[PDB]
Design a protein around this ligand. Structure first.
Ligand SMILES: [Mg+2]
Ligand SMILES: [Mg+2]
Ligand SMILES: [Mg+2]
Ligand SMILES: [Mg+2]
Ligand SMILES: [Mg+2]
Ligand SMILES: [Mg+2]
Length: 170
RNA sequence: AGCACAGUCUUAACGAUGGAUGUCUUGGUUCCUACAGCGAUGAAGGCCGCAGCAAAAUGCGAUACGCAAUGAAAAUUGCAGUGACUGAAUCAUCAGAAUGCUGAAUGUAAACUACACCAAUUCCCUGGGAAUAGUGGUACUCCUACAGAAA
């Protein structure tokens, strides 16, 4: 895991190996999540899967629409990536389970590190035009998540100068 | 419990992606030396097989990842099983035995497992007693010899 931690007794990790979801959507979701209390994040994810609150697409925002929900995050564009959220939800659940297994109270857990990397793409073919084969690759991703429990030198001359200054001020 | 606008750009740290670099190396390459042909006694090439659980390659040929014999010589192992306390398990050696269907392919054929014709053939026992439609043979050219016919 990419973080600096010090005390892993207070942390709960969780990963997804090679998730068959789009990196960009899931990245966006992760961004939306990060620095949330775990339960709140979970709630948010559930809302997005039932299309009630959007995830705002701020970085990878080419063509993404113009939802009414994005006002909540001071933004115009947003989406409700379902599959991505589901995958993320699963990994959140895993994290929660891990925390439980340890002695971490899930109320006090913050997502300190939600990392999404892109994984090696699965290759397929698409057929175009005048007998031209093109790639039709997935962009799967690795997800790492870390929840975490939360609550000179003087000198004589210099000294003299200082004293003088003080006197002057007085 | 709070606080960071977001995006773009940059730097550093820590990761992903990728397979560079370095290190290897049962491979190649070159040169040198040595021998040097296989085949109607069916070659090379090709098919089809063959393992207890077996695809490829490797090896082998209805005795089919091997038989005999020789020289090692106690194991072989994924499991099953087979062996030792030396013709036995495994290696090498390989001279004996065997070597499917083809292929020059050669009885006529050939996108045929098509078809002829001549021998019936084969084994066992010391002259009989058993098998099996199975096994051989038959190309063209040529040579020597023989044959009885032709001018
Ligand atoms: Mg900003
Ligand atoms: Mg010669
Ligand atoms: Mg032997
Ligand atoms: Mg021996
Ligand atoms: Mg023939
Ligand atoms: Mg025909």
């Amino acid at each position: 895991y990419a973080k600096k931690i010090r005390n892993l007794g207070k942390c709960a990790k969780g990963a997804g190996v090679d998730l068959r979801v789009h990196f960009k959507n899931t990245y966006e979701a992760a961004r939306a999540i990060r620095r949330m209390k775990l339960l709140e994040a979970k709630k948010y994810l559930n809302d997005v899967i039932e299309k009630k609150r959007c995830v705002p697409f701020r970085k990878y925002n080419g063509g993404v629409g113009r939802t009414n929900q994005a006002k909540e995050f001071n933004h115009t564009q947003g989406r409700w990536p379902a599959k991505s959220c589901k995958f993320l939800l699963n990994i959140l659940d895993n994290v929660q389970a891990n925390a439980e297994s340890r002695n971490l109270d899930v109320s006090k857990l913050r997502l300190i590190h939600v990392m999404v990397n892109k994984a090696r793409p699965g290759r397929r073919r698409t057929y175009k035009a005048h007998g031209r084969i093109n790639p039709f690759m997935s962009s799967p991703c690795h997800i790492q998540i870390i929840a975490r429990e939360i609550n000179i030198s003087n000198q004589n001359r210099l000294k003299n100068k200082s004293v003088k200054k003080q006197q002057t001020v007085q």
